[PDB]
């Protein structure tokens, strides 16, 4: 449920005894945890929301000029004053201009004048700030079993219902026991800080279009500043790059405005992530986090339930996911009550030889009603399959044949783990989460090493990191004393793998 056909999902287990399943919660995929007990659970990060943003310096990219002024002065009488310049609403620059005979100025030679004009502007760039507090995570999770066609479509009553739950997380209130009447308590405690490395992030809204920007880049943009300001005529700062002054070969200086650079800041925005409904409530797309998840109290609701002997029937052609598993929605009337129902698979029967991954443990049916649809899934082994459902003779079976080999499973798992290794960096650790020694060792070694990788190879671009990896390779063959040339090979391969990022 809720995590099928959402590829980039994962399945994580926990070696039973001391529920310690710290998942790397994803705002761009789902994660399903399983346990021999403790009905299998999913978690998917719906949205990310920020409550309060502060109004740091704004920017203007659309300006307008008027009431120009030159204020010529003789080659020797000082240089131009132009009382206009007195005001800051005007932008002015002072230029040495030629002044000859038949030009006034009984002398002649290089004189000077100060060309300038009013700086009126429009289309401000509200570059607000946000901080790791009064931001807000909002997730929804779903246990399997009941709830034919889970399917967020009618989520409203599903958080009121038992199979789905909606959770809000604050850096003030990190804990949340996702309580499911009859199912469990789903203990959760997360790190609402180290998700997106906030406090270096600004919420820019330009043309009612919002996004997040690494505040360093936002500080480095050379447009006019509102600079902190509030109401009152905006005294724009630096006021110069926008307008452009130009004299003739020697004389008569004028000014151009260079219009609006809206699309220019767009093409300069080539790394930000866009963001939506903003109100006093600013929502944004993906951003990960670390969530210690505990199976403290999850009762499976119907381990004692009988296996009512009605004949079961498929409805939809149980296609499989990229993760190899396969979901089926099986309907049946014929019996009543809160039923337990069998679901196994085999290679031969007259054995039924229950084999393979059972994901949707304790599949439960609610009521006496007609052919309830009983959505669930299982995962077959690498060969042909025989998924068996009903009970015995009036059961229903079906071929599968996963067609995914065991070494192939390791392939998909390791390339997935490697992509995690890349994008989550340190956080890719404790993903399969037991508090084992080598786990904290990996966390720490990546901590120091990748932090150095940041501070040394600061924000290496696509092309940059590409050629850096290439020349590191070329050098990894050249140098003697493999000890360091192997380190060249290592960093170069790290760089190239970083260039194998999601971009493909």
């Amino acid at each position, epitope marked *: 449920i809720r995590c099928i056909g959402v590829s980039n999902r994962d399945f994580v287990e926990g070696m039973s005894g001391g529920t310690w399943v710290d998942v790397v919660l994803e705002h761009g995929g789902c994660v399903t945890v399983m346990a021999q007990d403790k009905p299998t659970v999913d978690i998917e990060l719906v949205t990310t929301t920020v*409550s*309060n943003m502060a109004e740091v310096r704004s920017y203007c990219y659309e300006a307008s000029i008027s009431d120009m002024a030159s204020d010529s002065r003789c080659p020797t009488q000082g240089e131009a004053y132009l009382d206009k310049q007195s005001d800051t609403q005007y932008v002015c620059k002072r230029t040495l201009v030629d002044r000859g005979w038949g030009n006034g100025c009984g002398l002649f030679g290089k004189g000077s004048l100060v060309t300038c004009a009013k700086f009126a502007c429009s289309k401000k760039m509200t570059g607000k700030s946000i901080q790791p507090e009064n931001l807000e995570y909002r997730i929804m999770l779903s246990v399997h079993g009941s709830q034919h066609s889970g399917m967020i479509v009618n989520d409203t009553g599903h958080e009121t219902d038992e199979n789905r739950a909606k959770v809000e997380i604050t850096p003030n209130s990190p804990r949340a026991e996702a309580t499911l009447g009859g199912f469990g308590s789903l203990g959760l405690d997360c790190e609402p800080r180290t998700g997106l490395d906030f406090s270096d992030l600004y919420y820019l809204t330009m043309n009612n279009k919002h996004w997040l920007v690494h505040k360093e880049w936002f500080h480095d943009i050379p447009l006019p500043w509102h600079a902190g300001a*509030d*109401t*009152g*005529t905006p005294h724009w700062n630096n006021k110069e790059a926008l307008v452009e002054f130009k004299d003739a070969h020697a004389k008569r200086q004028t000014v151009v405005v260079l219009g609006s650079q809206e699309g220019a800041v767009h093409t300069a925005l080539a790394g930000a992530l866009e963001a939506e409904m903003d*109100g*006093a*409530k600013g929502r944004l797309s993906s951003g990960h986090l670390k969530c210690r998840l505990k199976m403290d109290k999850l009762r499976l609701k119907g381990v004692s339930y009988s296996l009512c002997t009605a004949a079961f029937t498929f409805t939809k052609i149980p296609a499989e996911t990229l993760h190899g598993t396969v979901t089926v929605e099986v309907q049946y009337a014929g019996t009543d009550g809160p039923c337990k129902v069998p679901a196994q698979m085999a290679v031969d029967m007259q054995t039924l030889t229950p084999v393979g991954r059972l994901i949707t443990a304790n599949p439960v049916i609610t009521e006496s009603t007609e052919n309830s649809k009983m959505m669930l899934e299982l995962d077959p082994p690498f060969g042909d399959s025989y998924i068996v459902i009903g009970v015995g003779e009036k059961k229903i079976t079906h071929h599968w044949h996963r067609s995914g080999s065991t070494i192939g499973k390791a392939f998909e798992a390791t390339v997935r783990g490697a992509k995690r290794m890349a994008v989550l960096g340190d956080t890719a650790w404790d993903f399969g989460s037991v508090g084992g020694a080598l786990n904290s060792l990996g966390k720490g070694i990546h901590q120091i090493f990748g932090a150095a990788f940041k501070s040394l190879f600061g924000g290496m671009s696509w092309f940059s990191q590409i050629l850096i990896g290439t020349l590191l390779m070329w050098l990894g063959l050249n140098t003697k004393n493999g000890s360091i040339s192997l380190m060249c090979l290592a960093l170069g391969g790290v760089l190239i793998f970083l260039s194998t990022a999601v971009s493909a």
Partner: antibody
Amino acid sequence: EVQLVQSGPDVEKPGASVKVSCKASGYTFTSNYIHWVRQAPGQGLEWMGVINPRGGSTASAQKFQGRITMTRDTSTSTVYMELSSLRSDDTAVYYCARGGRALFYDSYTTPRDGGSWWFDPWGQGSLVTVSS
Amino acid sequence: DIQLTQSPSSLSASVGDRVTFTCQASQDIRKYLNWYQQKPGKAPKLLIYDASNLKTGVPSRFSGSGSGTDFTFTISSLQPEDVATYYCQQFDDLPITFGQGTRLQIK
């Protein structure tokens, strides 16, 4: 006794500038954010802006950006409000009020408030009319 | 962004009645809400800070409550000095707005 006092009612030209004074009494003048709030005769109250008696810090709302100026006068413990480019809506009564933990120079509302948030010295109200 | 509706628009009641005013804002104003009552030609009357707190000197005839986005003020017993226009106003995010009003009348 903590108490604010405004200047007398005034009538101005459309497009002129009016300055209303607000003098404080009974407290250390540098410890209370002065809030200005407008009220049209039939309309409700709408907060105009805020100034800090210390350091002359200022802020307002966009309904007055470019016309409103707010200055301090530490000597007589006063704050002066100028509305510029007067307009037919300006005929109203304006109120000045002391507010909260005026520590440095700001509005500063993420921390606490109340305890006469800004309501002990609401003074008397400055009636202004804008016509010819 | 600070739109705050204050219901009803007006009311009129006899002496000794309870009356309640509601104000819901479009935003989250967790506890930064305040309440006044003002006569024409008056500085307003000490009613409520933080939407739940009685000020010193205020009669216990008044009370305020509400948590998330909508908040209720209440006069326990109506009295002749209760004729005024009542106002609720938020404190956060600083385009500070007030309600248009809730007006009273004795019968």
